[PDB]
Amino acid sequence: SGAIYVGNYRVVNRHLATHNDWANLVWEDSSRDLLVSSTTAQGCDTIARCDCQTGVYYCSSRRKHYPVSFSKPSLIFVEASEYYPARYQSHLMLAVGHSEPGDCGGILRCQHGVVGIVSTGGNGLVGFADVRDLLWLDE
Ligand SMILES: NC(=O)[C@H]1CCCN(C(=O)Cc2cccnc2N)C1
Ligand SMILES: [Zn+2]
């Protein structure tokens, strides 16, 4: 679990969005596993606007943060799950690191701010849904 709170927006994994997220929907994209909902309270997370390929993510299944080198956002095949059929997930970045299904939503950050959230994993890999191209989150 986990979310990004920026301005009047909450960014979550689309497969973990709640009834309240869907009732306050702003934008969603199944191909990216992202959903953004509106909030009444002001969020103060900062979104990175950069091309960093190193950062630190929070891993809930270890209660720890890990440093990672990750690939640029790209179209990556993701095997079928209870939430989606087998498909290409877009804007996904992979890195070597520990992840379990419940780790989805953990934030990846670089020195500029939030980069994205955990969305995929298994086999000593961890995948992050990029949010740096969503310029409207702060303007
Ligand atoms: N974005 C998606 O389609 C995901 C939806 C939930 C299931 N998916 C995983 O990759 C889970 C996973 C397995 C093993 C280790 N870590 C994990 N995060 C795919
Ligand atoms: Zn950066």
Curated annotation (Swiss-Prot):
Q: Which reaction does it catalyse?
A: Selective cleavage of Tyr-|-Gly bond in the picornavirus polyprotein
Annotated active site residues, numbered on this chain, are: H15 (for protease 2a activity), D33 (for protease 2a activity), C104 (for protease 2a activity)
The source's domain of life comes to Viruses
Question: Per UniProt, where does Zn(2+) 1 bind?
Answer: C50, C52, C110, H112
Complex formation? Homodimer.
**Role noted for this protein:** Cysteine protease that cleaves viral polyprotein and specific host proteins. It is responsible for the autocatalytic cleavage between the P1 and P2 regions, which is the first cleavage occurring in the polyprotein. Also cleaves the host translation initiation factor EIF4G1, in order to shut down the capped cellular mRNA translation. Inhibits the host nucleus-cytoplasm protein and RNA trafficking by cleaving host members of the nuclear pores. Counteracts stress granule formation probably by antagonizing its assembly or promoting its dissassembly.
Return the protein name: Protease 2A
User: Lineage of the source organism?
Assistant: Viruses, Riboviria, Orthornavirae, Pisuviricota, Pisoniviricetes
